[PDB]
């Protein structure tokens, strides 16, 4: 176990910090909130996103074939 | 500039008390103040209005981390209520 006293070394840092009831917890919830989560949704669709598209695809392929395979079936069997 | 403009502005009579303790006589201090103070307030200012505003209090904090000194320092305080509140006492 590691306690508060003993975790690392700190040299010249300042922190200013305010009370709860001091403040709003909710500052610009939609002003600020909206851009950031486009900005951090386009900072990663890229490397998210094509993967799923991939397994999209080649779910709704894969179910289509599976219909035209034995339902398209016949097709031809003339004599 | 910056210096006499706030002696000026401060360095006023009503502002000023001469007090004094021991072997003396009121009457001799009286006698004192009214020889080399008077002429101090010949002239009470136009619109120049020291008054203090309050100053909010704030909930808050700040920590400067410093783990090259070896002893640590803190001061706790809530909002007191002021020189004249009887609270004090």
Same mark, same amino acid.
């Given at each position: 176990?590691?306690?508060?006293?003993?975790?690392?070394?700190?040299?010249?840092?300042?922190?200013?910090?305010?009370? #709860? =009831?001091?403040?709003?917890? =909710?500052?610009?919830? =939609?002003? +600020?909130?909206?851009?950031?989560?486009?900005?951090?949704?386009?900072?990663?669709?890229?490397?998210?996103? #094509? #993967? =799923?598209?991939?397994?999209?695809?080649?779910?709704?392929?894969?179910?289509?074939?599976?219909?035209?395979? +034995?339902?398209?079936?016949?097709?031809?069997?003339?004599? | 500039?910056?210096? @006499?403009?706030?002696?000026?502005?401060?360095?006023? *009579?009503?502002?000023?008390?001469?007090?004094?303790?021991?072997? &003396?006589?009121?009457? $001799?201090?009286?006698?004192?103040? $009214?020889?080399?103070?008077? %002429?101090?307030? %010949? @002239?009470?200012?136009?619109? *120049?209005?020291?008054?203090?505003?309050?100053?909010?209090? @704030? %909930?808050? $904090?700040?920590?400067?981390?410093?783990? %090259? &000194?070896?002893?640590?320092?803190?001061?706790? *305080?809530?909002?007191?209520?002021?020189?004249?509140?009887?609270?004090?006492?």
């Amino acid at each position: 176990g590691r306690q508060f006293g003993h975790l690392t070394r700190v040299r010249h840092v300042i922190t200013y910090s305010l009370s #709860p =009831f001091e403040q709003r917890a =909710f500052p610009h919830y =939609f002003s +600020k909130g909206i851009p950031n989560v486009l900005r951090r949704t386009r900072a990663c669709i890229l490397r998210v996103a #094509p #993967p =799923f598209v991939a397994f999209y695809l080649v779910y709704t392929w894969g179910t289509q074939e599976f219909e035209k395979s +034995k339902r398209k079936n016949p097709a031809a069997y003339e004599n | 500039a910056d210096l @006499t403009e706030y002696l000026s502005r401060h360095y006023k *009579a009503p502002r000023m008390v001469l007090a004094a303790a021991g072997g &003396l006589e009121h009457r $001799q201090l009286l006698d004192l103040a $009214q020889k080399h103070f008077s %002429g101090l307030s %010949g @002239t009470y200012d136009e619109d *120049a209005v020291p008054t203090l505003s309050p100053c909010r209090f @704030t %909930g808050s $904090q700040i920590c400067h981390r410093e783990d %090259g &000194l070896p002893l640590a320092h803190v001061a706790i *305080a809530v909002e007191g209520p002021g020189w004249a509140h009887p609270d004090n006492v």
